[PDB]
Amino acid sequence: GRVIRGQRKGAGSVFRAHVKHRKGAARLRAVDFAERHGYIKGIVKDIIHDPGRGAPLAKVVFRDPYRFKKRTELFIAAEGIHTGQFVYCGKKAQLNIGNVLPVGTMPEGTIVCCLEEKPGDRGKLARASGNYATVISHNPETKKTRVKLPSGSKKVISSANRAVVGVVAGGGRIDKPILKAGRAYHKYKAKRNCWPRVRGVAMNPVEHPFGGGNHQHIGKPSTIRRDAPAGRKVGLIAARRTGRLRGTKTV
RNA sequence: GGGGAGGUGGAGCACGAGCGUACGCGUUAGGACCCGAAAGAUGGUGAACUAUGCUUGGGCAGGGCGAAGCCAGAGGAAACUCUGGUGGAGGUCCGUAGCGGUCCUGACGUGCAAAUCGGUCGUCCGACCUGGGUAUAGGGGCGAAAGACUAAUCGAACCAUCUAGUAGCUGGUUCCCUCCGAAGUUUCCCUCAGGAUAGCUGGCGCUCUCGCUACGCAGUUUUAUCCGGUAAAGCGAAUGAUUAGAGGUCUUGGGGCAUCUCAACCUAUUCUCAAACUUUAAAUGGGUAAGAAGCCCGGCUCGCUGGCGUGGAGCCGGGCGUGGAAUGCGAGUGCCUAGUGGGCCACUUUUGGGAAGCAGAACUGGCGCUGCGGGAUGAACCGAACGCCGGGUUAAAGCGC
RNA sequence: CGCAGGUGCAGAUCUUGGUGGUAGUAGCAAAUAUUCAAACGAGAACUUUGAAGGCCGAAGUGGAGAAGGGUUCCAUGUGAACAGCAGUUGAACAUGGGUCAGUCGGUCCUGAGAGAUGGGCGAGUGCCGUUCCGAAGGGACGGGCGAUGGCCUCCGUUGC
RNA sequence: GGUAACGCGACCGAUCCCGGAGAAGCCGGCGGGAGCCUCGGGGAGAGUUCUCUUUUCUUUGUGAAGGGCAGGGCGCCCUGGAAUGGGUUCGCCCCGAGAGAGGGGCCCGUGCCUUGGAAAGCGUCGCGGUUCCGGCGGCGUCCGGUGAGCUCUCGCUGGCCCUUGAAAAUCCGGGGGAGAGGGUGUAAAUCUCGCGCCGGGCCGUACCCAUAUCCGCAGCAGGUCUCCAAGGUGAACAGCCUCUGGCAUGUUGGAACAAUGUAGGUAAGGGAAGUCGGCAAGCCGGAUCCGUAACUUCGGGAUAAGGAUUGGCUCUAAGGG
RNA sequence: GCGAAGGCCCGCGGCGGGUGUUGACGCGAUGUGAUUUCUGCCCAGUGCUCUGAAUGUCAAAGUGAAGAAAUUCAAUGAAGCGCGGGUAAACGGCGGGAGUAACUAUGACUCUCUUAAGGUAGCCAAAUGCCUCGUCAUCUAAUUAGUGACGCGCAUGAAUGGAUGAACGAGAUUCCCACUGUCCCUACCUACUAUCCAGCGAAACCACAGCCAAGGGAACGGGCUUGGCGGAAUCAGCGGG
RNA sequence: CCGCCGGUGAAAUACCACUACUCUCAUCGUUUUUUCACUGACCCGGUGAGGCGGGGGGGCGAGCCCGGCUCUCGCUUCUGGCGCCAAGCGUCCGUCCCGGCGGGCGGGCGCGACCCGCUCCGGGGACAGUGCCAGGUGGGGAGUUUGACCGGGGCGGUACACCUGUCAAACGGUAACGCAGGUGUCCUAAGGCGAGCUCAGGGAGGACAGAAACCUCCCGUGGAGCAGAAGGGCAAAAGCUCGCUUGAUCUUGAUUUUCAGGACGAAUACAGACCGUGAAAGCGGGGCCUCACGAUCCUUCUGACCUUUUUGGUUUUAAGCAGGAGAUGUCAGAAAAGUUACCACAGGGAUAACUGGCUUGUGGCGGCCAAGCGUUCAUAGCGACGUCGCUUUUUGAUCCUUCGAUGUCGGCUCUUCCUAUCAUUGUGAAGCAGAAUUUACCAAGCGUUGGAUUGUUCACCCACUAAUAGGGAACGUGAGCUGGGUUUAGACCGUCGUGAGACAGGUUAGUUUUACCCUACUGAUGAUGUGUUGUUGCCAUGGUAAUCCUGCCCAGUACGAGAGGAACCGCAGGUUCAGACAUUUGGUGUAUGUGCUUGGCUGAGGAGCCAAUGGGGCGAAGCUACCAUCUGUGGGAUUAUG
């Protein structure tokens, strides 16, 4: 047989991301002396739209503490921030929507977004529109903090991780039905070449394990093991269960 | 460590025949008699078509419907409703340019054209059409998915090489005359369109034999002597099959009523039968013998056998040619060996099948390999087989034209 | 007389070349259309001029460009071959000639992307990689410290 | 200099820092300007005149770059304080965060006049030399009106997007004030102001751009990216006829008018009886006025279905600046 | 499925690449296919997936023992299988056999077998029904066609999606009005051919060739046998050979 | 007294030392493991590697003790401003000036801006990761395979290795997917020997006892048994019952069967050993005889005072020699699943799917006999039980022709032929009164229709009709059409399959090429001859054509009880076909004839033109329609019959 559609994606030729009109990597500022000990004041200059990304981005201008120059950062816009607002980054920053604070100084129940997975990153978790993480508890002896992620999972991170107070702007985007093949087309024209999805049962057996037959049927169980080769791992990969759920399933 | 006797296994010995060289034929390994695959592999070249993503440009009359928002009026008691305008939404409708390609299964169909032409058709603000520039390259790409497209090539492109790839399969295989002359059958084989094997053929010889100025043999008969269970015949003979009367009677029999008839059994007869039945039993078959390798005398050897001068076998001398049926004929023997290993027809016999110019056997002859006279014509029938000719005569068949 | 062959063809839908019958046959039928007179000329249905009749009917059968072509452009001459009839004609053949820029483009900039060095990988030609594992500046206001040249009291050029 | 918006011909200044321009989608609706078309007159030339037509046809300029003035736009300024709310657009929309009213400021100015400029170009009437003199000369190149008209362009203002519609060279403005200049000369540093002097090298440039210069073996009914775009009819870049321009019927002609064919028509009376099947053809068709069902996701179905009218000529009424 | 020392994937190779200028309202992998109304039962089988291990099997390496060593033996012995779990909008599957309600025919309520459940709601001679042109009705004069019904349905059936349904369709089908050369049944007209001429000028194909009947023959002859017969050179058509 | 002597302690015990199955405690013992911490290898992230860890010093405070002691903190949180390139101090210079110090001019350094400490900061970390080996999983990928025979292949069978009877034609041999059957074993005896008996069945008797219990006599040629199927063989046997045994053992050759006169299997006579049995002669090296089985290579066991183990020697190991065993059943012995409708190549008429040819079971159509049917009566008309044929418009059977191709179902169109005759002409017979009908003869001249459904042939119905007969011609006819069906590639459903995919099931869409050659045929010129040429004519020979029905009258007549109900002559017409023809009606119409009319154009009128025939009305001539009209015929010899 020939290599299959999922295999062809990793080559990254026609399936690469469309990044011509994107505004840059949305991320926090690099940790420094001011954010480690006190705070630093920046100003929101514009709220801009990033193609392929539902969440709006905020352009925040800071002032360099070592030479005469103004810095420009691209943040994930917490819902509520506005142009002309002053945002504060540091361990002494107050608990306000839009500020960047270590999760250790945050109280329990605080809602955060653009959370660092490991200290010194620039925001890695809870970055999509309408998403947030919650601080559950701290452990000042080991300098660890538990956080609930938007998937429902629970994670122990370092308390020096930083985050933005609030939720990511643009929530409810999935509530409106797309309603149109064309609107789906325009949605993925800004992201990557993945949208019009042909079914494997509609293919020939040479391009998919589910192809062929005089009827349009899978012919073999669609639940596949984790160790299956690349051209075989199609269907439901390592499914712990199948069918309609009755309740909430979590680890 | 070396000897003996008696059996068996050896490509051995037993007064060498080989080596070198040339030629011919045969079997192979090699391109391997010549031409022929579908494939496989290794390195390369293509996205000037087309598929998809990206960058930068360009393009899309005129009409219909009339979403939201806004204005005014009428209400009603209010609720809120109704009316007339304005407005210009939409993967909205008609329909140009453009893009596409339904039906006529129209034209053309050695065309204008290796896919075009006409009328009629679908869409025509969108998932729209399009130029250039870019990216993805062959078990790879790309695919709103047809195994589609990837330079008229796609169920793995094209180029060169490995490569004169292999082929039990198809086609072809070049001068003359002379002589000899087949097989389609046996056994083994993933053997059934092929081989190996025996058989049939040819060539080279060789060992002898007869005769003039016989070593022996035979697709024949006869004379002796065995072998057989087919044709026939048989069932008052065995095993099976089977028809009808008759004469008797024990009846763990029945029926109609002291019973009496049936049935049963027995006995003697009677009709009809057998590839897998038989007492009997042909015709045509098959084997052996018809002398000198025989016959008859005398002696010797033996470890075998043994009452014995026994028996059996072997060996050494001697004698006997009326050459011990007919007919015909010169025999024996070695090496090498090609083609063939699809058969078919007829008298008789014969299996399956209603049968067949059907399928399968036996014997002999024939066609195939073969022409000639006759059957008008015809592979096989009847007659007869062939160097080039003259005379004569026939066969089978004929003699109205 | 001997020696040695790439030594004899009717076939192989054999190979190369040549030639027939078909056959003066099929055909020279897509988009309405030509006529009169004259000129040159050996020669005119087809060239040129004039006069008529028609067509494209501005999303043209018009006027200009991009690709691509490469002299096909222009003048003169020829009528051998070619332009599937002719031809006095041609995008044919021959002889000459023709493309002039500071202000129109290229040239410059980056885009999608392509691609070296450092580094890494790799038997290897090489490949991955484009900021990532680099001591990646060769410049400049200005100041100072010296040489040098000038319309040299002074200024400028050149090294640290 | 101006209360201000900003203005004037210049109006010093480095490292450094901030910003702007280059630099942004598609669709709709209005308005301004130009080109084209149109209408009424005046010139010059031409056509028709059998009868009429004071007619019909052609033609009737002012480049860039400066200067001035219209005109368009403005979330620019000053006075002032609005409800009995007012202003205003086709739509909207705007106002105590300052409406209306009045007065200013700026930007664009492709329009008009002007320098260029009539000396040139065109039209027409004549006179020369000789193949060419940009020969010479006379007269003219005028005055108006219209518009949802078409095209281009400049603006304003909206709609749509889970789509938000490049980057870099290059150029400019501002913040700061390290520095420089001269002591009162008729002076200095400095000047993005006016004029004057010198230079701008290399490559491309002819022509075809397609029913004959390109690809399809060819002068091949195929294919191949764009720009400009008159009159009439009419909704129209539809189809039909015409002007500017172009052409010679698409690699030949003459004669005839047979069959069969290809393409285009018509047909009495029936009206799908043909055929697998109404295939093919035919019916209907535009606009105006009426009238429109089942069903329905309430949007539609819908040009449902069905009916009437439609020419020419002569009038009337209404709709504006 | 995945919280990034990750999921999916590329690559001969480098903690090299794509998604990713990304972070669960995201990326990747599948199935079904608007809206409406529903989506029944089965985890035995095959997959996928979780850990309790009572824990059995279980290589290399390591450990110990015997022998002079090569060797041999023993214990130990990871994942996987086994073992117990989930799970069908995973692949799929959804039967009979009995026991029986006052004419029948039909026949709930009870129990059992394989290999777990026995086909629920709906729907149907359907694009799915062999028998079959099923039976009834309607459509016509006449209907193997159409439609509506019926239910033991060879072999319907519920995201291998069931049922339905406005709007839409160069999709398949039946009937009706209108209209007609589709037809009865053909005819006439027009242009371009074909035609003839001047000029130019191919190709396919070709053992030899070319009149029949019967015969026999490789069983359907142009040739052979026996009969019928046979007269130069050609033109336009034609489709038997 | 503790003590075997005492449950007559099953020995069980005082005295002693050992180990035996379990538990616990430990070991500076051995090894293997689990957890926590460290950093330094190794990894990840951030940054322009910009302030890390301690010690401070002063200031902001909080507490505590009577100035300390401990701790905190690092100067920025109303405004959509500004922020760098040091101020200020404290010192050191001038080759510089003006009065050692001062002033001016130009400079330097330190603090402002603390010191020290080894990794820039943070997060992991001896894990992850990498290299090498080992086990699992792995159609993601690669390579390959997927028997043969066969009245085509497949499905089915095994006729593939063996045995019995028959075929088989009286030696032997002899084929078919011929017939009837058996085999892949079974046996320590069912092998070997000896002895002694006689079996199946039947008759007659005997308590329970009977058709079958056991006892006795008699008859018994085997009619029983001998294990496997069948055939042969066998009676003081080879059968039954006992007794003893292992000749079913160890060896070398020869031979038979199949056969090539290789092998294997099986078998036959000997020979040399060692044994069994019996008194002995003898018999016995498996089964009474003909079936019951297996190469090389590899493995495994057994045998020898065996041979090699590579410089020699000893010992393990290994190799060899000989005989058994582990197996190939496709049985002379490869290691092996499917699909292809997306397909490919070499071939085959050695072989299927058409026609044709043989055959005719089946289909269809006839005939003979006569049991019955027909009120009566075998035969008007039929015809049982039987029996003989014909035909090739059914389907089979076969495989001769064609696989370097003979285009394939049906319909449409068109011609000709056959008769086994539906009608019509002429007849014969009847259970023929008339009418209607049935049976048969000559006979194929003429005719045999319009439609609904279906792709259909076939069928069925509706309706006319004289009748609505059956067939052939390569199952006539595709360079004649059509393409509905069947028969490619797209797609859907059901069932089957794990799947790829299959369906002799349904459904929908799906390119129909070439004639100009020869002949045939249709027409058209022409040809040889009569000296040339023309006119008028004759005829050989070939073709051939007419067909059927109404109404009136006969006549409400014959016939018949009635009901009903004809026919010949004659008259008037019509159907189908054929040959012509336009006077008339209709069609056509570009006479481009004459009006009308739209758009445009020639200045307008008049007159015209263009729009591939602009459109439309009416139209001459011509052509043409059962859509008008006209015409269509006589004898001869005879068939069946009388």
Curated annotation (Swiss-Prot):
Its main location: cytoplasm. Pfam families: Ribosomal_L2, Ribosomal_L2_C. One of its GO terms (cellular component) is postsynaptic density. It is found in: Cytoplasm. Transmembrane segments: none annotated. PROSITE patterns: RIBOSOMAL_L2. One of its GO terms (molecular function) is rRNA binding. Hydroxylated on His-215 by RIOX1. The modification is impaired by hypoxia. One of its GO terms (biological process) is translation at postsynapse. There is a cross-link at K41, K148, K233, K249 (Glycyl lysine isopeptide (Lys-Gly) (interchain with G-Cter in SUMO2)). Keywords: Cytoplasm, Hydroxylation, Isopeptide bond, Ribonucleoprotein, Ribosomal protein, RNA-binding, rRNA-binding, Ubl conjugation. Residues 206-231 are annotated as: Disordered. The modification (3S)-3-hydroxyhistidine is found at H215. Component of the large ribosomal subunit. Interacts with CRY1. PANTHER family: LARGE RIBOSOMAL SUBUNIT PROTEIN UL2 (PTHR13691:SF16), RIBOSOMAL PROTEIN L2 (PTHR13691). Belongs to the universal ribosomal protein uL2 family. Component of the large ribosomal subunit. The ribosome is a large ribonucleoprotein complex responsible for the synthesis of proteins in the cell. This is Large ribosomal subunit protein uL2. It comes from Mus musculus (Mouse). The gene is Rpl8.
